[PDB]
């Protein structure tokens, strides 16, 4: 319960950070 929620929250943070980096790279590519 608590540990599962905490672990999924870390996973979803890491996933969202990956999406942020990917979107920033796509923004630079689209500007080019």
């Amino acid at each position: 319960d608590l540990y599962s929620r905490y672990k999924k929250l870390q996973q979803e943070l890491e996933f969202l950070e990956v999406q942020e980096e990917y979107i920033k790279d796509e923004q630079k590519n689209l500007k080019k």
Partner: protein, 82 residues
């Protein structure tokens, strides 16, 4: 108990703002994509040649028109489906 709750709350708020930022960034990306695509279609539609301009003498068929292209002359042309 309280360790898990505190960690979960910190992660909840941080990932909530992360998700809002991600939605904003994706909206901006889609706007840039729209701009780039519009420019690309403008280029493509500019590469096609200009079409001739001619007056219609009369319609001959349900699919053929007797036009007069200046200065080439008169043509029996076919009609587009639109």
């Amino acid at each position: 108990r309280q360790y898990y709750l505190s960690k979960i709350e910190e992660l909840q708020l941080i990932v909530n703002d992360k998700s809002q930022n991600l939605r904003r960034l994706q909206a901006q990306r889609n706007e840039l994509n729209a701009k780039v695509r519009l420019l690309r279609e403008e280029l493509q539609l500019l590469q096609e040649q200009g079409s001739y301009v001619g007056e219609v003498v009369r319609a001959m068929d349900k699919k053929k028109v007797l036009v007069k292209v200046h200065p080439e002359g008169k043509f029996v042309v076919d009609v587009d489906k639109n």
